[PDB]
Design an enzyme around this catalytic site. Structure first.
Site, PDB file in Angstrom:
ATOM      1  N   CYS A 118      18.038  12.385 -26.363  1.00 53.88           N
ATOM      2  CA  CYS A 118      18.011  10.968 -26.608  1.00 53.88           C
ATOM      3  C   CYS A 118      17.241  10.640 -27.884  1.00 53.88           C
ATOM      4  CB  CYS A 118      17.362  10.309 -25.374  1.00 53.88           C
ATOM      5  SG  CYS A 118      16.686   8.610 -25.424  1.00 53.88           S
ATOM      6  N   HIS A 175      12.008  13.295 -22.255  1.00 49.80           N
ATOM      7  CA  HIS A 175      11.620  12.319 -21.250  1.00 49.80           C
ATOM      8  C   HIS A 175      12.781  12.142 -20.273  1.00 49.80           C
ATOM      9  CE1 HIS A 175      13.507   9.752 -24.463  1.00 49.80           C
ATOM     10  NE2 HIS A 175      13.954   9.025 -23.440  1.00 49.80           N
ATOM     11  N   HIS A 211      13.140  10.295 -32.556  1.00 44.65           N
ATOM     12  CA  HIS A 211      12.227   9.468 -33.339  1.00 44.65           C
ATOM     13  C   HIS A 211      10.881  10.142 -33.498  1.00 44.65           C
ATOM     14  CE1 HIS A 211      14.044   5.403 -31.951  1.00 44.65           C
ATOM     15  NE2 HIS A 211      14.652   5.926 -32.997  1.00 44.65           N
ATOM     16  N   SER A 220      14.950   8.666 -28.748  1.00 44.71           N
ATOM     17  CA  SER A 220      13.509   8.477 -28.720  1.00 44.71           C
ATOM     18  C   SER A 220      12.728   9.756 -28.958  1.00 44.71           C
ATOM     19  CB  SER A 220      13.012   7.899 -27.390  1.00 44.71           C
ATOM     20  OG  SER A 220      13.784   6.888 -26.747  1.00 44.71           O
ATOM     21  N   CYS A 263      16.662   7.974 -18.094  1.00 46.48           N
ATOM     22  CA  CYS A 263      16.486   7.109 -19.239  1.00 46.48           C
ATOM     23  C   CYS A 263      17.697   6.303 -19.601  1.00 46.48           C
ATOM     24  CB  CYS A 263      16.059   7.873 -20.466  1.00 46.48           C
ATOM     25  SG  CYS A 263      15.550   6.732 -21.790  1.00 46.48           S
TER      26      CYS A 263
HETATM   27  N1  SAD Z   1      14.474   2.273 -29.967  1.00 45.09           N
HETATM   28  C1  SAD Z   1      15.023   1.949 -28.806  1.00 45.09           C
HETATM   29  O1  SAD Z   1      14.393   1.709 -27.760  1.00 45.09           O
HETATM   30  C2  SAD Z   1      16.499   1.894 -28.896  1.00 45.09           C
HETATM   31  C3  SAD Z   1      17.318   1.604 -27.854  1.00 45.09           C
HETATM   32 SE1  SAD Z   1      18.970   1.432 -28.276  1.00 45.09          SE
HETATM   33  C4  SAD Z   1      18.383   1.896 -29.878  1.00 45.09           C
HETATM   34  C5  SAD Z   1      19.411   2.070 -30.938  1.00 45.09           C
HETATM   35  O2  SAD Z   1      20.564   2.405 -30.151  1.00 45.09           O
HETATM   36  C6  SAD Z   1      20.912   3.754 -30.439  1.00 45.09           C
HETATM   37  C7  SAD Z   1      20.773   4.487 -29.098  1.00 45.09           C
HETATM   38  O3  SAD Z   1      21.623   3.872 -28.110  1.00 45.09           O
HETATM   39  P1  SAD Z   1      23.148   4.346 -27.947  1.00 45.09           P
HETATM   40  O4  SAD Z   1      23.187   5.300 -26.808  1.00 45.09           O
HETATM   41  O5  SAD Z   1      24.024   3.119 -27.836  1.00 45.09           O
HETATM   42  C8  SAD Z   1      23.411   5.384 -29.398  1.00 45.09           C
HETATM   43  P2  SAD Z   1      24.247   4.656 -30.811  1.00 45.09           P
HETATM   44  O6  SAD Z   1      23.542   4.900 -32.117  1.00 45.09           O
HETATM   45  O7  SAD Z   1      25.638   5.191 -30.578  1.00 45.09           O
HETATM   46  O8  SAD Z   1      24.158   3.058 -30.559  1.00 45.09           O
HETATM   47  C9  SAD Z   1      24.459   2.144 -31.637  1.00 45.09           C
HETATM   48  C10 SAD Z   1      25.922   1.682 -31.550  1.00 45.09           C
HETATM   49  O9  SAD Z   1      26.110   0.563 -32.414  1.00 45.09           O
HETATM   50  C11 SAD Z   1      27.199   0.798 -33.333  1.00 45.09           C
HETATM   51  N2  SAD Z   1      27.052  -0.048 -34.557  1.00 45.09           N
HETATM   52  C12 SAD Z   1      26.323   0.184 -35.672  1.00 45.09           C
HETATM   53  N3  SAD Z   1      26.309  -0.903 -36.462  1.00 45.09           N
HETATM   54  C13 SAD Z   1      27.082  -1.784 -35.819  1.00 45.09           C
HETATM   55  C14 SAD Z   1      27.207  -3.129 -36.163  1.00 45.09           C
HETATM   56  N4  SAD Z   1      26.724  -3.656 -37.288  1.00 45.09           N
HETATM   57  N5  SAD Z   1      27.900  -3.865 -35.273  1.00 45.09           N
HETATM   58  C15 SAD Z   1      28.439  -3.352 -34.164  1.00 45.09           C
HETATM   59  N6  SAD Z   1      28.319  -2.073 -33.854  1.00 45.09           N
HETATM   60  C16 SAD Z   1      27.604  -1.264 -34.658  1.00 45.09           C
HETATM   61  C17 SAD Z   1      27.313   2.299 -33.460  1.00 45.09           C
HETATM   62  O10 SAD Z   1      28.607   2.742 -33.879  1.00 45.09           O
HETATM   63  C18 SAD Z   1      26.956   2.714 -32.013  1.00 45.09           C
HETATM   64  O11 SAD Z   1      27.984   2.856 -31.012  1.00 45.09           O
HETATM   65  C19 SAD Z   1      19.848   4.380 -31.296  1.00 45.09           C
HETATM   66  O12 SAD Z   1      20.469   5.357 -32.158  1.00 45.09           O
HETATM   67  C20 SAD Z   1      19.298   3.158 -32.013  1.00 45.09           C
HETATM   68  O13 SAD Z   1      20.068   2.825 -33.174  1.00 45.09           O
HETATM   69  N7  SAD Z   1      17.076   2.115 -30.079  1.00 45.09           N
HETATM   70 ZN    ZN Z   2      15.075   7.437 -23.608  1.00 44.73          ZN
END
Ligand code: SAD
Ligand code: ZN
Ligand code: SAD
Ligand code: ZN
Ligand code: ZN
Ligand code: ZN
Lengths: 374, 374
Positions: free
Chosen positions: A46, A67, A51, A48, A174
């Protein structure tokens, strides 16, 4: 046999940030009073703990990250009333100590004996139970699940069902629980409602599953990457909208197609601009927007107070607002009762010695979830 | 006698912004179907119609401002089922049309047939019922209560108790209801809770009264002006803290004295910096912050999403979340049943021909509330 004493095993160490993990042999100390020692079985990868690696989540280095995992109970320390050797369990990165005012509070879930806010990378007694050649290795979120064995305090382990598939239920530690609770427990989505989820990685897929469980009649999944639309759809979205297809701003197009704004909007991307765009497109007089997660590096976001003035709610939370120890058994029983599938989120399963490879997948992102097996 | 026909009377006209009001003689047209014509008795003076005057709240000029008042029913138009001539009533600046989705919604109160969002300064039929020498004068918030007589649509008048003191219950048409509901209806303050109210003008005093009604065991009133602390105290504050006395930031001092942050924080000042400071000092894992009001000129405020992530709720609303037509009778009955006093908020009573003078008081601000009598 290992029960009274120190185990020697492989685990993933970060000795230095921005470095890949070293598979090392380490010495897992025996559990003291109210500690549990767990033989890991499957742990997910994941963002985190990636990070951590980048320097972004500051937790003391060297460290055993991890985690999100499920495993079996080996040794229990003195005064351990909730688990007994051989129990299936899931480490809890956000605890449930039972005593503080968040644990007492009927909604709060961000337990004060947590190592997230001010991370010291230790067990509750301020010490570590890891030493690689005499040098001590810090614990991560009082879980450290990238190790063949680990020791957690009795407030950071929940016992689960005996028939539980641990290569599939580790998600409940998680990512699935963080999204399915952001829908079911935090936003308290309703029967009939229109939800919009922004971003559709494994967490956005867990939201859609929760919104589906609450009975939303619309789940609009929105992602700038078209390829995400299928699984999202499979999991419950009724429509998927790709922001780059429109000449207008999507909150326009979303209020437009929702008849004045959706009920519940969720930000699963983590960006500042979309936290604002998802706030601005739930209904003015009564919509709820829920920030599912925000990167530890985030700076300030510009927002105009007017948006709240109409009558909106902006909500954030950790682990889908679930009080950890109470809820995770109940989610597993639900998975067990075939209420939800974990299967479309699990895209890869790699052996634990291939942890660095699981990271590569996460970092170029086409991988919903990589699980690592022991 | 006036019943079938046009009345000619004095009213306050703004012909041009940033100009004092002209007491003029105007012609109040008779009410058409589902309109009511009201003989005013007492109207309060409030910041929002002074924002009109400055150019800030953009509503079409020339206009009869005024939104906070109580009076008696003179003529009723065709198909008026809720009021009958001689009824005591309060004009509703935010309506309760009964049909839209906000009126149907169990919490929404910002009724879609409102003239706040996109102000056209008219009656529901797009016309005006005011003409000063043939020239038409626009209506304000479909109330225009700075006139001896006015016409409101049946969705913008609530009937109240016959024994009601109209020089005192006119507050229930804006300022008291906006604060007492921000405490009682929006934040849903609890028995035992610790509340912090920021700013203590008449609205901050109405919050303290609501928080008191919900049973908060602490109401910390905070204002950079010491002289405000007495009445606030009188009305319910348990402690008053003057930000300029401390070398530290007050959210520090407030989380410090609250043991980790208060339950409910309220921003009655209207500034961006304090909307942020009041968000940052309710508890991390479960505190609720409520923006009571924000000036129509506001720009963006910088905030770091982290604050919501812990588990906070940020809430704004119009008229204390009260559905107007339903609630205002119930508040008056409560005042009537000696549940709350309106008296410490009413600081001045001037004759209506002294409207410009009531403004002077509001603009140099030592005046909690100036009421204007007819
Ligand atoms: N720090 C945290 O607690 C936390 C929770 Se969710 C989070 C963010 O979410 C991601 C982890 O969650 P996840 O499992 O969904 C992985 P992820 O990186 O796949 O989630 C982000 C999603 O948003 C999409 N995306 C990017 N830009 C846009 C935009 N402008 N508009 C619409 N869609 C877009 C990506 O293609 C993707 O599916 C992390 O990589 C991070 O960017 N951080
Ligand atoms: Zn997590
Ligand atoms: N636009 C709105 O909808 C709206 C609602 Se309340 C609101 C603001 O509130 C005022 C109207 O409400 P009210 O009846 O309370 C009149 P007010 O102007 O008396 O309210 C503001 C209060 O905050 C105090 N104050 C100013 N700066 C600080 C500070 N930095 N920290 C603490 N206290 C401070 C003032 O002394 C005062 O008591 C308006 O003048 C405007 O500033 N605007
Ligand atoms: Zn606790
Ligand atoms: Zn309505
Ligand atoms: Zn007002």
């Amino acid at each position: 046999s290992t029960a009274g004493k120190v185990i020697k095993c492989k685990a993933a160490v970060l000795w230095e940030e921005k470095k890949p993990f070293s598979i090392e042999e380490v010495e897992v100390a025996p559990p003291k009073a109210h500690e549990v020692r767990i033989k890991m079985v499957a742990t997910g990868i994941c963002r985190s703990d990636d990070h951590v690696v980048s320097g972004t989540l500051v937790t003391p280095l060297p460290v055993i990250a991890g985690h999100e995992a499920a495993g079996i109970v080996e040794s229990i320390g003195e005064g351990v009333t909730t688990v007994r050797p051989g129990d299936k369990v899931i480490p809890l990165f956000t605890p449930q100590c039972g005593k503080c005012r968040v644990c007492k509070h009927p909604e709060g879930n961000f337990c004060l004996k947590n190592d997230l806010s001010m991370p010291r990378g230790t067990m509750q007694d301020g010490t570590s139970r890891f030493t690689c050649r005499g040098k001590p290795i810090h614990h991560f979120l009082g879980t450290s699940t990238f190790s063949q064995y680990t020791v957690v305090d009795e407030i950071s382990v929940a016992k689960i069902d005996a028939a539980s598939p641990l290569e599939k239920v580790c998600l409940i530690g998680c990512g699935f629980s963080t999204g399915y609770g952001s829908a079911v427990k935090v936003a308290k989505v309703t029967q009939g409602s229109t939800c919009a989820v922004f971003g559709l990685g494994g967490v956005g897929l867990s939201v859609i599953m929760g919104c589906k469980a609450a009975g939303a009649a619309r789940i609009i999944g929105v992602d700038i990457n078209k390829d995400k639309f299928a699984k999202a759809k499979e999991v419950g979205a009724t429509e998927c909208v790709n922001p780059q297809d429109y000449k207008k701003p999507i909150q326009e197009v979303l209020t437009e197609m929702s008849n004045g704004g959706v009920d519940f909007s969720f930000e699963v991307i983590g960006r500042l601009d979309t936290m604002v765009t998802a706030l601005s497109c739930c209904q003015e007089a009564y919509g709820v927007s829920v920030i599912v997660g925000v990167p530890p590096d985030s700076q300030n976001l510009s927002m105009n107070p007017m948006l709240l003035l109409s009558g909106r709610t902006w909500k954030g939370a950790i682990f889908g607002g679930f009080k950890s120890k109470d809820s995770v058994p109940k989610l597993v029983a639900d998975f067990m009762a075939k209420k939800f599938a974990l299967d479309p989120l699990i895209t890869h399963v790699l052996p634990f010695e291939k942890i660095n490879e699981g990271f590569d997948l996460l970092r170029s992102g086409e991988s919903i979830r990589t699980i690592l097996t022991f």
